[PDB]
Short mmCIF file of C-alpha atoms in Angstrom, two decimals:
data_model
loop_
_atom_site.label_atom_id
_atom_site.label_comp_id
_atom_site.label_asym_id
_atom_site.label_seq_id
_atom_site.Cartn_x
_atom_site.Cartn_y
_atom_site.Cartn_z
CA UNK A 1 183.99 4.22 -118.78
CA UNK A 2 181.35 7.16 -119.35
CA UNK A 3 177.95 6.07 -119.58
CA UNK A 4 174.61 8.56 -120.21
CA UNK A 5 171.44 7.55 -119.10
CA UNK A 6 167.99 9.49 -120.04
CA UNK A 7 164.88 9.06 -117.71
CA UNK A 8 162.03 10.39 -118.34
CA UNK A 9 158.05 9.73 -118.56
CA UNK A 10 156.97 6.48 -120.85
CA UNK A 11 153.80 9.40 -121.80
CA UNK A 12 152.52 12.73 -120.86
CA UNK A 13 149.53 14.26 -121.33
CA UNK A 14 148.87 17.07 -124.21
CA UNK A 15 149.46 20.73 -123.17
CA UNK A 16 151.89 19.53 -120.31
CA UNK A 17 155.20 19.63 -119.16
CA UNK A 18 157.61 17.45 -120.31
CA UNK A 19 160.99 16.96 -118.53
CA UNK A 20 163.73 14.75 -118.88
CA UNK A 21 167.05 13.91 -116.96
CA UNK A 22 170.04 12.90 -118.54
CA UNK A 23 172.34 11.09 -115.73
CA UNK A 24 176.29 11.26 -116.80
CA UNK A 25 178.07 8.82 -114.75
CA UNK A 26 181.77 8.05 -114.83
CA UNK A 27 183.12 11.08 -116.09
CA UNK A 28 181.22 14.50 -114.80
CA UNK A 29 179.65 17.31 -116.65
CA UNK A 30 182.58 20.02 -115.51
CA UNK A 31 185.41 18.69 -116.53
CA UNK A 32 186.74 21.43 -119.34
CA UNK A 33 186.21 21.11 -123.24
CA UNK A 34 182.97 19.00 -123.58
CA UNK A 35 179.23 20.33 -123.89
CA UNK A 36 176.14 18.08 -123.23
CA UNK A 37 173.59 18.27 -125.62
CA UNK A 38 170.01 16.73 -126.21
CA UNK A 39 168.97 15.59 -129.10
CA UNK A 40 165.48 13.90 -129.98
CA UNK A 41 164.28 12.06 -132.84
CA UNK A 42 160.48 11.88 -133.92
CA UNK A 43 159.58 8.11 -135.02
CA UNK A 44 160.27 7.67 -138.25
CA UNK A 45 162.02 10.48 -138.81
CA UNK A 46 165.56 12.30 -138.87
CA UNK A 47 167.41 13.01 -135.49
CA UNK A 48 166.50 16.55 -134.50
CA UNK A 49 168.69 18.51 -132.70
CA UNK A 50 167.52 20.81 -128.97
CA UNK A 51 169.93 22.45 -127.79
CA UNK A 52 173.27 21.59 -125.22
CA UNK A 53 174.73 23.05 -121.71
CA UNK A 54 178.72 22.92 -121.72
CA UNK A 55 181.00 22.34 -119.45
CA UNK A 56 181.43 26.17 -117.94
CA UNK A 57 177.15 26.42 -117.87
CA UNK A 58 176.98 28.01 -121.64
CA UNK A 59 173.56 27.19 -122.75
CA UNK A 60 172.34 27.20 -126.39
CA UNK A 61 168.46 26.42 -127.70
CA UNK A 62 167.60 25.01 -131.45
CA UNK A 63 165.21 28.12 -132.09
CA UNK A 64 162.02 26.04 -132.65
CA UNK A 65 162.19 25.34 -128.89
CA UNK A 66 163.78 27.90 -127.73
CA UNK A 67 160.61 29.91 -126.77
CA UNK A 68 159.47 27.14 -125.12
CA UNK A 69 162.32 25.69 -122.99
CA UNK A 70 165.17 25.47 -120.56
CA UNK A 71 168.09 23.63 -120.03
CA UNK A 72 169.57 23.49 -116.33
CA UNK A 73 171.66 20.79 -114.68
CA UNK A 74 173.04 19.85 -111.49
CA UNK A 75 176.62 20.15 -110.83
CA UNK A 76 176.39 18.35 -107.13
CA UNK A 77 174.48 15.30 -108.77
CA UNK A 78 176.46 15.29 -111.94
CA UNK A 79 173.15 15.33 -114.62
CA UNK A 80 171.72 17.48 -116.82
CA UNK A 81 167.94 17.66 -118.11
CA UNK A 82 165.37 19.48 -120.31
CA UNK A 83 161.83 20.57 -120.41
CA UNK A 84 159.21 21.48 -123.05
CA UNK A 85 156.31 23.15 -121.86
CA UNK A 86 152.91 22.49 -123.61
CA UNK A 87 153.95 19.05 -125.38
CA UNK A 88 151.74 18.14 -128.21
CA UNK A 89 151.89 15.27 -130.41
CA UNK A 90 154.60 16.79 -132.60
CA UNK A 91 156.88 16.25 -129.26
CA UNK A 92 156.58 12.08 -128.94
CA UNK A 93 159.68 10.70 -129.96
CA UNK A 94 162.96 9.17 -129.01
CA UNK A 95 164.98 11.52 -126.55
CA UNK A 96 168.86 11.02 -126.53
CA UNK A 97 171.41 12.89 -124.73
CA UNK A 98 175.13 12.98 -125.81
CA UNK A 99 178.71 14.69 -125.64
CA UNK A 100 181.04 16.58 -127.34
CA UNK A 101 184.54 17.04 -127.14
CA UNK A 102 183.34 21.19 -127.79
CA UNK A 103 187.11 22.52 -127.93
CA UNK A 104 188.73 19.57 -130.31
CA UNK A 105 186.85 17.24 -132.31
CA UNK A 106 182.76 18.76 -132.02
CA UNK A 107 181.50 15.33 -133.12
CA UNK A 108 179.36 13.26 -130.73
CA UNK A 109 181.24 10.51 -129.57
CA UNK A 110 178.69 9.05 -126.41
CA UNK A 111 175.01 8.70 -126.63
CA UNK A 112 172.88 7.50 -124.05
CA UNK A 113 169.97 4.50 -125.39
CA UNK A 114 167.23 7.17 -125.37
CA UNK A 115 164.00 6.70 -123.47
CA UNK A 116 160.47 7.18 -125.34
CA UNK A 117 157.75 9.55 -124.79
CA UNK A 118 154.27 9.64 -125.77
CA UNK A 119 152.57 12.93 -125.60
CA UNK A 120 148.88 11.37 -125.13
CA UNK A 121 145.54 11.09 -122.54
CA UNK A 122 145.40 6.96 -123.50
CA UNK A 123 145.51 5.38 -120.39
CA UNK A 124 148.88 3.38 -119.60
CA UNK A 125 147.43 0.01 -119.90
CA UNK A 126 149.77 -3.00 -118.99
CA UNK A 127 150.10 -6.41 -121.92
CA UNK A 128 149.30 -9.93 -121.53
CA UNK A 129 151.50 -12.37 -123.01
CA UNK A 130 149.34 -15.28 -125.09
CA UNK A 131 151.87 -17.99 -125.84
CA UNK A 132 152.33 -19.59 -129.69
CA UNK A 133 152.76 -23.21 -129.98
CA UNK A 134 152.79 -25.10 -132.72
CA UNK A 135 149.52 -26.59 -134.16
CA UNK A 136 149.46 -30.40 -133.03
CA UNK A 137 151.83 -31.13 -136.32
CA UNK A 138 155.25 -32.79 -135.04
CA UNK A 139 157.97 -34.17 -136.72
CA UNK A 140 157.66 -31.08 -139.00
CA UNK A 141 160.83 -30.44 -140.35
CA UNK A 142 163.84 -30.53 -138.29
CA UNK A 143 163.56 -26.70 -136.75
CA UNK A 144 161.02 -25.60 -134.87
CA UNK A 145 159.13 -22.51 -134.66
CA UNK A 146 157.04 -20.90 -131.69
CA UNK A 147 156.72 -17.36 -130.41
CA UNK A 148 154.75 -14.57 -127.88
CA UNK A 149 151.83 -12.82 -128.74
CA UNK A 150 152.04 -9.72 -126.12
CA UNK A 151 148.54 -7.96 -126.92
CA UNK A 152 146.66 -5.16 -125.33
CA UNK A 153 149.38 -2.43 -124.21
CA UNK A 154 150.16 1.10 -123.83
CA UNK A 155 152.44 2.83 -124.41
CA UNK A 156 155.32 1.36 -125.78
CA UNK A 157 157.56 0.24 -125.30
CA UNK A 158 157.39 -3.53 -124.50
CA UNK A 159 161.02 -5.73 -124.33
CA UNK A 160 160.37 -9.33 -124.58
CA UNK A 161 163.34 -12.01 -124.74
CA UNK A 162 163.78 -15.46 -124.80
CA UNK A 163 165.32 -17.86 -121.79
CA UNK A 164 166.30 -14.24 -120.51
CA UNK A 165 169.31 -13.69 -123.13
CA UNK A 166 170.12 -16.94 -124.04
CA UNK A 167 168.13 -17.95 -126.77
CA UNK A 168 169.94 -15.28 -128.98
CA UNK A 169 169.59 -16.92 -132.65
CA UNK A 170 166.31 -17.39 -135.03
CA UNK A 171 164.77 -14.35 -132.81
CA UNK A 172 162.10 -12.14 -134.47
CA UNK A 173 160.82 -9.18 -132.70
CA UNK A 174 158.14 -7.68 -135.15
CA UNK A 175 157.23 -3.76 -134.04
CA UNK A 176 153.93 -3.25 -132.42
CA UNK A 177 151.21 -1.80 -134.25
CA UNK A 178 148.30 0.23 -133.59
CA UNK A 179 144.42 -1.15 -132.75
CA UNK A 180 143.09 2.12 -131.29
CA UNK A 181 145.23 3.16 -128.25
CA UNK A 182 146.59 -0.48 -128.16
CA UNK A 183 149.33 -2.00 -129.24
CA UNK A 184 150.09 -6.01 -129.94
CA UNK A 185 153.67 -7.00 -130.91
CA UNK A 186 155.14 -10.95 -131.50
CA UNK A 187 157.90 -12.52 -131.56
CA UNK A 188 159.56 -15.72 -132.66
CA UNK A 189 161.60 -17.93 -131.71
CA UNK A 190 163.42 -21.23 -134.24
CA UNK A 191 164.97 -23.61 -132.26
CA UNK A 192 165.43 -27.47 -133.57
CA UNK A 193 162.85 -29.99 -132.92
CA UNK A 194 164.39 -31.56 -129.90
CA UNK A 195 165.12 -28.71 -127.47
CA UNK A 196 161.17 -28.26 -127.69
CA UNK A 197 159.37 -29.85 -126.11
CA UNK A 198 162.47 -31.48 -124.37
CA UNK A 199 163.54 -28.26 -122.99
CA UNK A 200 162.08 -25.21 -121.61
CA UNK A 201 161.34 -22.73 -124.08
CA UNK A 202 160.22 -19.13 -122.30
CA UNK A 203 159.61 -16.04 -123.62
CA UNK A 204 159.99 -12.69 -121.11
CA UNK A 205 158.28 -9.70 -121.90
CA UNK A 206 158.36 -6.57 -119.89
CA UNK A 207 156.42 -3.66 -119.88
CA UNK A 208 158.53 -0.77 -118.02
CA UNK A 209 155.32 2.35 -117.87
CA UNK A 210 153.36 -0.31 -116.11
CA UNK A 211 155.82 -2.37 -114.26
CA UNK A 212 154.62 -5.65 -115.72
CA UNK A 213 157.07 -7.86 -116.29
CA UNK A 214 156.06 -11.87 -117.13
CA UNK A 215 157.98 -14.93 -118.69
CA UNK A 216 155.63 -17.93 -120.44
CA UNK A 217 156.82 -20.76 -121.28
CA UNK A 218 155.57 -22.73 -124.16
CA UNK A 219 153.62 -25.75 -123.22
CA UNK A 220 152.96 -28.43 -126.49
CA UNK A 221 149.19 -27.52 -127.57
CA UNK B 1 182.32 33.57 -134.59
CA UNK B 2 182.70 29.20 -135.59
CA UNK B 3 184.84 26.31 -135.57
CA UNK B 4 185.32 24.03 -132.41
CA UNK B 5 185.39 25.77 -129.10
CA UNK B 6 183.11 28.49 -130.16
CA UNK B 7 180.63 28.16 -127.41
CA UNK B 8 182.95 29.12 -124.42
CA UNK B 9 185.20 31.88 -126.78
CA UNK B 10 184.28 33.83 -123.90
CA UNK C 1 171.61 28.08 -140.20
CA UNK C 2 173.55 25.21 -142.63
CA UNK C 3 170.99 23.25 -144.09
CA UNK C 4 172.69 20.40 -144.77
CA UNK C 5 170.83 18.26 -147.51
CA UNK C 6 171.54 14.09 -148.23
CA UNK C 7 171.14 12.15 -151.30
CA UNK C 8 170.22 9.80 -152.35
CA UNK C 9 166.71 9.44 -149.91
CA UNK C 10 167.28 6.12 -149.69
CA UNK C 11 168.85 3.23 -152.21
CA UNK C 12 169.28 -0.51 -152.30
CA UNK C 13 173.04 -1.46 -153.19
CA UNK C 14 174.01 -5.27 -153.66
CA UNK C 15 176.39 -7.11 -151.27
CA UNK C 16 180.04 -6.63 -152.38
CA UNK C 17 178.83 -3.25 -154.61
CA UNK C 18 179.27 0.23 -153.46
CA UNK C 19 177.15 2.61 -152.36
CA UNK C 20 177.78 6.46 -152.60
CA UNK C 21 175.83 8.35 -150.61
CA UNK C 22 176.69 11.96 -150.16
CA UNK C 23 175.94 15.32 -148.38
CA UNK C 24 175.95 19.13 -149.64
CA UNK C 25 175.82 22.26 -146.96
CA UNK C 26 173.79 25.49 -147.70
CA UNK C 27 177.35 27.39 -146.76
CA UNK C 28 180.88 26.68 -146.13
CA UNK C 29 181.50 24.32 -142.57
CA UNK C 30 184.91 25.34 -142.88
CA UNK C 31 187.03 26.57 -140.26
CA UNK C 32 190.60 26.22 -138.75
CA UNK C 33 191.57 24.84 -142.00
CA UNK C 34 188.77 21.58 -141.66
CA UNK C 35 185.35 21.09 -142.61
CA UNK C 36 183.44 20.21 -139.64
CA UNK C 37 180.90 17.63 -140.72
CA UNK C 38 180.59 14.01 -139.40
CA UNK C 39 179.03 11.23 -140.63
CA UNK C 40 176.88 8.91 -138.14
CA UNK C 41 175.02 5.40 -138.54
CA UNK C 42 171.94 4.18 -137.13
CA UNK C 43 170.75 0.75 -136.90
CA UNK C 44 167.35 0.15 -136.03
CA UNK C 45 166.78 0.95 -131.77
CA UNK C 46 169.77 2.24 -131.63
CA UNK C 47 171.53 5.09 -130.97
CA UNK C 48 173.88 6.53 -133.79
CA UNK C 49 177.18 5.53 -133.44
CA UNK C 50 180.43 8.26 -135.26
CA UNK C 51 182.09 6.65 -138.47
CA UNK C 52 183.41 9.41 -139.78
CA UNK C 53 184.63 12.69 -138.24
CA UNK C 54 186.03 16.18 -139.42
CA UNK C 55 185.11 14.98 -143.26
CA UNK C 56 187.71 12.36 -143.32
CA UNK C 57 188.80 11.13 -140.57
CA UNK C 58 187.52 7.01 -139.33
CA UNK C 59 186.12 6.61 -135.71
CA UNK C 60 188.20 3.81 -134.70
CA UNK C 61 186.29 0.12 -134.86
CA UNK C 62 184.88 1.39 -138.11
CA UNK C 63 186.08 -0.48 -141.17
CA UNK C 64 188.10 0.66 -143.74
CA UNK C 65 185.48 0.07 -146.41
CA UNK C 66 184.02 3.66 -144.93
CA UNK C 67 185.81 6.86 -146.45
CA UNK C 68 184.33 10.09 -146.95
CA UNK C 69 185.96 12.99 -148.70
CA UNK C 70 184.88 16.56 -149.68
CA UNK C 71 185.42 19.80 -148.49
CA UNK C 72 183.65 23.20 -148.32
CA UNK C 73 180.31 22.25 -149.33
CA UNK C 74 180.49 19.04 -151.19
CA UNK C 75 181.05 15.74 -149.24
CA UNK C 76 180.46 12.04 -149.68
CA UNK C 77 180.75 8.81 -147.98
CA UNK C 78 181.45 5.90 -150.11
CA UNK C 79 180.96 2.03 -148.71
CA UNK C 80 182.55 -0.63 -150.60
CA UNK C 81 182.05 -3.25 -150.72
CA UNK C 82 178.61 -3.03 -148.62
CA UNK C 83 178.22 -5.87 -146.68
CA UNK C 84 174.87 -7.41 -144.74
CA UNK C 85 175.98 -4.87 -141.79
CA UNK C 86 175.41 -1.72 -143.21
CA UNK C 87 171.74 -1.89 -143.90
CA UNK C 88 170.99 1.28 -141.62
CA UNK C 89 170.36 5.20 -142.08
CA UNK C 90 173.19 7.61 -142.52
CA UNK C 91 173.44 10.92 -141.53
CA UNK C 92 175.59 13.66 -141.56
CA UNK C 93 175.95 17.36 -139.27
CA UNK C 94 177.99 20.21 -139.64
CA UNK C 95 178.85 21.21 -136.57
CA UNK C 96 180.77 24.44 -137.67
CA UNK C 97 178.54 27.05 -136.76
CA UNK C 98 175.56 27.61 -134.26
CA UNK C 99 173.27 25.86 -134.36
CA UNK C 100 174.19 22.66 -135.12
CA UNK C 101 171.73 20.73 -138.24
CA UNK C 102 171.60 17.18 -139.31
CA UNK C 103 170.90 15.74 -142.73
CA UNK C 104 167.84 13.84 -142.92
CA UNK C 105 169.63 10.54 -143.51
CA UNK C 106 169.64 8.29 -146.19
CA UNK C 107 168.27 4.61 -146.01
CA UNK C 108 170.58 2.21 -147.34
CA UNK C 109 168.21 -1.04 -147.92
CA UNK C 110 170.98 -4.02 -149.47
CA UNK C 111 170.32 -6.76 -152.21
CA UNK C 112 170.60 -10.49 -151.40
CA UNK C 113 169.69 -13.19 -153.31
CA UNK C 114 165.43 -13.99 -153.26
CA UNK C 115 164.71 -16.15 -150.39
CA UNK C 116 161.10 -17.85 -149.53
CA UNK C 117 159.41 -17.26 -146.70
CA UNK C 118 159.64 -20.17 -143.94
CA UNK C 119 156.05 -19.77 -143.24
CA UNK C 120 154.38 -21.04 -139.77
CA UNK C 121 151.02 -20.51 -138.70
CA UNK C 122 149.91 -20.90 -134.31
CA UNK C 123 146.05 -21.45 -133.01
CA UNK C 124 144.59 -18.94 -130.23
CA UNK C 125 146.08 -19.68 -126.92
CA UNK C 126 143.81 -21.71 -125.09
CA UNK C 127 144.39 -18.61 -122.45
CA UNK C 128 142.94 -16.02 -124.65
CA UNK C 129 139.86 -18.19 -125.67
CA UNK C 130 139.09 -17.77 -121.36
CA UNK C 131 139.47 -14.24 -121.50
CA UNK C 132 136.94 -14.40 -124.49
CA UNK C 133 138.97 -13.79 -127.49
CA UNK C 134 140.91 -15.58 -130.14
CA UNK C 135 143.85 -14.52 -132.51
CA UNK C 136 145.33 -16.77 -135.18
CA UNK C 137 148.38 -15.72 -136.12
CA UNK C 138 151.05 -16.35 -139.45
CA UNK C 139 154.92 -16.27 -139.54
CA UNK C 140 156.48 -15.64 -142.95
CA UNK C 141 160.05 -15.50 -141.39
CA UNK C 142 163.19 -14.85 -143.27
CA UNK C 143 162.71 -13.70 -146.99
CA UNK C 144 163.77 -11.37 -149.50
CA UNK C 145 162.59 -8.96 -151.29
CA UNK C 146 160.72 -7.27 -148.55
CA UNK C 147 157.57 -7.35 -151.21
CA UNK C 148 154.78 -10.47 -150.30
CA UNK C 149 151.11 -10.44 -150.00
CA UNK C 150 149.26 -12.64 -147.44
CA UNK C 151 145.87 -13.77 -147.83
CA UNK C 152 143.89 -15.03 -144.68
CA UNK C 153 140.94 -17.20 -145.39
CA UNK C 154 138.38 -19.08 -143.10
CA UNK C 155 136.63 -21.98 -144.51
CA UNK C 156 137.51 -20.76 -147.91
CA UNK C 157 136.04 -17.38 -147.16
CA UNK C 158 138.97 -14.83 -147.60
CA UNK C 159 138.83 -12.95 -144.36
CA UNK C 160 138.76 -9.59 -145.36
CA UNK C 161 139.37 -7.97 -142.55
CA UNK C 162 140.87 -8.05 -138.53
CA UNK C 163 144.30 -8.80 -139.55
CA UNK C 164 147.12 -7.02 -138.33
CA UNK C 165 150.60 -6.91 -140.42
CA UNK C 166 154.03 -5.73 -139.37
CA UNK C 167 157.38 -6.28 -141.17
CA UNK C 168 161.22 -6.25 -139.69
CA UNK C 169 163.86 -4.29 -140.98
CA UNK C 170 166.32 -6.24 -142.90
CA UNK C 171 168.37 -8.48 -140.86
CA UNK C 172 171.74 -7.36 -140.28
CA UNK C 173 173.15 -10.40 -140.36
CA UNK C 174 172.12 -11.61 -143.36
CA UNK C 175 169.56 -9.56 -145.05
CA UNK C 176 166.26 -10.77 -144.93
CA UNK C 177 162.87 -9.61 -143.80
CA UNK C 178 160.37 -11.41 -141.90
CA UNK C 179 156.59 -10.47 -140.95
CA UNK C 180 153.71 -11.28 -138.99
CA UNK C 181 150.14 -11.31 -139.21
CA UNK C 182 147.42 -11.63 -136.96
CA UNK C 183 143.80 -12.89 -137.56
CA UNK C 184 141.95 -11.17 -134.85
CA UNK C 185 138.52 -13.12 -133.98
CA UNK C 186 135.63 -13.57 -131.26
CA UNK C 187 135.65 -16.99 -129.49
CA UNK C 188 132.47 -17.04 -131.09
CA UNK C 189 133.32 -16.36 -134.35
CA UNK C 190 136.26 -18.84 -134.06
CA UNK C 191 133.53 -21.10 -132.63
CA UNK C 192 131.59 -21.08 -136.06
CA UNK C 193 134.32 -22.80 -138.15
CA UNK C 194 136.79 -25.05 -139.00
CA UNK C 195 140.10 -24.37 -140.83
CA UNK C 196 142.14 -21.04 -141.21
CA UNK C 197 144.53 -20.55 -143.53
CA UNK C 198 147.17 -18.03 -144.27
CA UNK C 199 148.39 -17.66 -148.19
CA UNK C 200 152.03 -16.19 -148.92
CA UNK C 201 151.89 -15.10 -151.96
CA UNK C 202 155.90 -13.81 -153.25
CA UNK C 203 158.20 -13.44 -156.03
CA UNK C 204 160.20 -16.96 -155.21
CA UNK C 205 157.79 -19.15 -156.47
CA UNK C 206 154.29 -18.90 -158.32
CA UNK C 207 151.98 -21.48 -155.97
CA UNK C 208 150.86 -19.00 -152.70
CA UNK C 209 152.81 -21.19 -149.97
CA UNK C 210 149.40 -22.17 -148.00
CA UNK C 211 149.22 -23.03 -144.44
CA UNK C 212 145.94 -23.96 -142.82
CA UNK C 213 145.17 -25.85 -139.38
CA UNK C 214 141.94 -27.34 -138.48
CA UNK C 215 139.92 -25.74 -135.66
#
């Protein structure tokens, strides 16, 4: 049924505008009762809340960012958005829109995924994807084990799977950490010793602020 | 004012 | 505004135990005869999702082994038995009164039985080496406790430094953690040796599980 969608810029430079969208589809932001609200979340940190636009145009602002923003939205186009002026580091985080049934329940019951920004002047630099396979040493065990090393990117995020979706099981994605304005992520992959080499084993990464997007597949050493 | 429907009371 | 404050920060409850995590507001989010205050979940990259709504009532899909109570300005959710799916952060709002505040969640981390790291180790990718660079990586995949040191060494000389660690969150499935690290060398420097190794040293058992590959 309803489904929210943010967009918005994978980074943004400091002392700059940020502005996101939030696109409502399948049920539309007039309809009587609900508000639309934004609501961000710093990495590793709580959910913050920014402020919300209901249903009859009422706006309200979270006072920390009240001096520094406005909420509008598009009645014709059915989609709300936001924008910070001056963005600093303190703004990167995870930006989420949602809804509220304002008149009954005043819970959030949809969320959208949440895009990422990056308040930053690194330059958007796409990954390469090194592929893991095992050492020379077969007939080890009875499982196993290769992955991706995506190295070299920025910003996040990166989203890597394996035989696009179907190797679902014995999947590790570790989180990307930080060599100086570049990240390097892996992930992992257990599947039993036939279907490898027998059959194709691929791993898919994809690198949305850079529109890379390349699949490797893992060739014995 | 509070409670649900606050935001459009008027 | 309602501050709303959580506690316990964060606590690790065993599988089948109960966990009682609960939430306190500065003032009253009373009105209409209810106490408007939810309770939300959030698993890792993901969005949170409602469990509980109004101070009592359950979201539908959410199992019975959720129940907050409370009223005024003392309220608790209580999971029992935990189970392997509710390692996540809980939160709860008020949403009485303008302008809305969260809690600052609380971390539920759950206890499994010890498990040893599967450990795996993978030789630069011939493609790197071309682009003139070479990382050895290490796979400790599926233990518990989250608590294990890793020492890299090349020809017996512990690399000190140029590795690069980063740990899961528990799995939600069944509990564990996993990590990663990466030896980050020069073709060069990979040039001028022989074997790498990767130590996994944990709590399951007392001989550092060693893996090492030969140049």
């Amino acid at each position: 049924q309803v489904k929210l969608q943010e967009s918005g810029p994978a980074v943004i430079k400091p002392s700059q505008s940020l502005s996101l969208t939030c696109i409502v589809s399948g049920f539309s932001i007039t309809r009587t009762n609900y508000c639309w609200h934004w609501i961000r979340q710093a990495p590793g940190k709580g959910l913050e809340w920014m402020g919300r636009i209901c249903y009859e145009g009422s706006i309200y602002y979270s006072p920390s960012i009240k001096s520094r923003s406005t909420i509008s939205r598009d009645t014709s186009l059915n989609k709300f958005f936001i924008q910070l002026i001056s963005v600093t580091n303190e703004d990167t985080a995870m930006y989420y829109c949602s809804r509220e049934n304002h008149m009954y329940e005043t819970y959030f019951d949809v969320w959208g995924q949440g895009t990422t920004v990056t308040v930053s002047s690194a330059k958007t630099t796409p990954p390469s994807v090194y592929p893991l396979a095992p050492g020379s040493a077969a007939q080890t065990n009875s499982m196993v084990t290769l992955g991706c090393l995506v190295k070299g990117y920025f910003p996040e995020p990166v989203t890597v799977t394996w035989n696009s979706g179907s190797l679902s099981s014995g999947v590790h994605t570790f989180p990307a950490v930080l060599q100086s304005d570049l990240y390097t992520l892996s992930s992992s992959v257990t599947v039993p010793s036939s279907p490898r080499p027998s059959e194709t084993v691929t791993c898919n990464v994809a690198h949305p602020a850079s529109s890379t997007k390349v699949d490797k597949k893992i060739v014995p050493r | 004012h509070i409670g649900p429907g606050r935001a459009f009371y008027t | 505004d309602i501050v709303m404050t959580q506690s316990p920060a964060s606590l690790v409850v065993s599988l089948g135990q109960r966990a009682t995590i609960s939430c306190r507001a500065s003032e009253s989010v009373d009105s209409y005869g209810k106490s408007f205050m939810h309770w939300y979940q959030q698993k890792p990259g993901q969005p949170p999702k409602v469990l509980i709504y109004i101070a009592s009532n359950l979201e539908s899909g959410v199992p019975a082994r959720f129940s907050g109570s409370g009223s005024r300005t003392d309220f608790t959710l209580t999971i029992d038995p935990v189970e392997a799916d509710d390692a996540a952060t809980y939160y709860c709002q008020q949403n009485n009164e303008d302008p809305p505040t969260f809690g600052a969640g609380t971390k539920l981390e759950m206890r499994r039985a010890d498990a040893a790291p599967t450990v795996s180790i993978f030789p630069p990718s011939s493609e790197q080496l071309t682009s003139g660079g070479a990382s050895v990586v290490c796979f400790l995949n599926n233990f518990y406790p989250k608590d294990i040191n890793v020492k890299w060494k090349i020809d017996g000389s512990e690399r000190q430094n140029g590795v690069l660690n980063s740990w899961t969150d528990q799995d939600s499935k069944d509990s564990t953690y996993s990590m990663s690290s990466t030896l980050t060398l020069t073709k060069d420097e990979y040039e001028r040796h022989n074997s790498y190794t990767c130590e996994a040293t944990h709590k399951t058992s007392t001989s550092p599980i060693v893996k090492s590959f030969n140049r």
